[PDB]
Design a protein around this ligand. Structure first.
Ligand code: GSP
Ligand code: GSP
Ligand code: MG
Ligand code: MG
Lengths: 335, 340
């Protein structure tokens, strides 16, 4: 009985797209020692990855300061070892490396390798993290990355209405377990890491990320079990997408040729003073998905897109509240 | 200094478009007070009287004229027409009963369905359906009753409210051609314009000259505003109002859209449409077409100095307004920061 009365929302999307970051935003709105481990862990992974990559790129990247070489040597030594003790000498080698113009130049070419999203975020606050009395903020916990293996349900009430939300693992190994969640689903929330148009998936290091998303979305929109189900599509990481468009170093055209003839829609509503180039790039990415969503469905289900930033509490509070009504509609449309 | 920190909003739009109704929603949602209670009951009564009189007055004046389903209902029509212009109408028990008996007459209903050929108020059927409730001595208006009620706006009224410790000064104006002269008094330091369009009026003519199409008047008014010199930098949040009335009208198909806006016959529902679950494709098509007519004007000038943010609304529906206005708060703040 309570079963059918529940608003059952299923988060889907590839890996590192923004799924658990959405759940975290839900707990902060409607609902620590291990967490500092995870934050310290992300911090270690960030630096190892950058320094490890310098001598593997083509052309390779060398240190701006030859005298930093011993620090590279340390980082690479303590690479994959058992439960690392995080000595003080770790925090200073990491900081000094991060300030090196060559370590940075390798960071700028990070789409050529597999770097985590929180990388810069955490590297900018090594001095805060290292303190004994350090207590992670709400934002730190949002940025913190922990890969999801398994199915995690999160229950929360909003204006007296109850929601049960399912977070899954995004990578390929995990997609098998998804079918275990298809029962009585009110709405699917599909998340997209929009800024990843110039990157490749971890699984095979060949498949374009944005492409993987488009296919996974195609598979979802046409799934035998989800014919009736409507999809709320978060075109996420708007902040990163913008920055990349404004940096102008990696072009969307090179990865997606069709963008060359693309023109901003007549009904595109840009943010106050938003650069025209951002507008175009963000609406292009949107229209890549709507092509798929309009191809089938026969009016049995619909796609409702939104531009989001999963790490922005006020953004996720706004977009989520603006959906509470259609979700109710969809639930009554199921009865 | 306090002047520059507040969020100034200006309700623009034609007569009977829905401006005052949006204002009452802001009060119901953000200000304190159940209701003068006595003055309003009188307004709702006047509303009821107008609808009934208007409908029957029209029967013989329509072409072809409509006749009573039951001829025995003639003394009723005779009464209604005989108390047309009484200034201090006492509302005797006799009024309510004649009104209720004619409203159930198939012929009067038939003339109601043809109200786009004359001038009938929005709340007609709402108040006529509860004539019984309205006549009791202990009759007190519900929120909905107050929202459906129609009073002409003759001036500028300001409503101040707060959401999340943020202050909103909202100015309501008169939409009829007569009042548009006063509009410049509110153009000072305005943060955003909310423009209300009565989507459903595609088949009606304005009161002022009984000739100009209400939707064309709204369009022309929007062009005037969008291209006004004092407003070159002020953005417009477009409320496409009367969606409930639009859908009814379209689902009935008794008066076609193309018959008033010919270009509709070659308009195709955008790829990016997001219909409500179980929405009739016809409805989705009509409502986007109307939205677009307005966007064609907004995208023809402005040069990045201001933009248009369209929304589909039903002002008499508190949840609809609550939701829509909340969705707007962040860009209203952004508009203000952009001004600094
Ligand atoms: N800049 C920025 N970072 C974001 C945004 N959304 C997510 N991230 C960051 O990206 C990372 C990946 O998101 P996360 O929630 O871990 O992905 P996921 O889809 O749950 O990953 P998985 O379980 O399938 S492997 C986290 O570090 C997170 O803080 C966003 O909009 N902007
Ligand atoms: N059913 C329905 N009625 C509506 C809607 N919006 C407004 N109305 C009705 O339309 C009528 C006019 O409302 P109002 O808001 O006063 O117009 P206005 O813009 O203030 O008009 P003016 O002051 O310029 S003359 C009222 O009867 C109101 O109840 C809506 O979305 N649906
Ligand atoms: Mg996850
Ligand atoms: Mg008014």
């Amino acid at each position: 009985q309570v079963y059918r009365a529940t608003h059952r929302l299923l988060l889907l999307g590839a890996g590192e797209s923004g799924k658990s970051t959405i759940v975290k935003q839900m707990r902060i709105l409607h609902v620590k020692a291990t967490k500092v481990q995870d934050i310290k862990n992300n911090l270690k992974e960030a630096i190892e990855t950058i320094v490890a990559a310098m001598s593997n790129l083509v052309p390779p990247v060398e240190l701006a300061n030859p005298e930093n070489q011993f620090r590279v040597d340390y980082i690479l030594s303590v690479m994959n070892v058992p439960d690392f003790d995080f000595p003080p000498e770790f925090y200073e080698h990491a900081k000094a490396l991060w300030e090196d113009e060559g370590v940075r130049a390798c960071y700028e070419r990070s789409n050529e390798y597999q770097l985590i999203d929180c990388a810069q975020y955490f590297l900018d606050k090594i001095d805060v993290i290292k303190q004994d009395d350090y207590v992670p903020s709400d934002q730190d916990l949002l940025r913190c990355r922990v890969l999801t293996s398994g199915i995690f349900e999160t229950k929360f009430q909003v204006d007296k209405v109850n929601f049960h939300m399912f977070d899954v693992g995004g990578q390929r190994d995990e997609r098998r377990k998804w079918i275990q969640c298809f029962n009585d689903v009110t709405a699917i929330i599909f998340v997209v890491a929009s800024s990843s148009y110039n990157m490749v998936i971890r699984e095979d290091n060949q498949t374009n990320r944005l492409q993987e998303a488009l296919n996974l979305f195609k598979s979802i929109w046409n799934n035998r079990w989800l014919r009736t189900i409507s999809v709320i599509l978060f075109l996420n990481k708007q902040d990163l997408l913008a920055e990349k468009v404004l940096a102008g170093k990696s072009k969307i055209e090179d990865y997606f040729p069709e963008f060359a003839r693309y023109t901003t829609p007549e009904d595109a509503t840009p943010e106050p003073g938003e650069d025209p180039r951002v507008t175009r790039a963000k609406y292009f990415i949107r229209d890549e998905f709507l092509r798929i969503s309009t191809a089938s469905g026969d009016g049995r289900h619909y796609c409702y897109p939104h531009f989001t930033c999963a790490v922005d509490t006020e953004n996720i509070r706004r977009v989520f509240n603006d959906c509470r009504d259609i979700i109710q509609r969809m639930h009554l449309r199921q009865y």
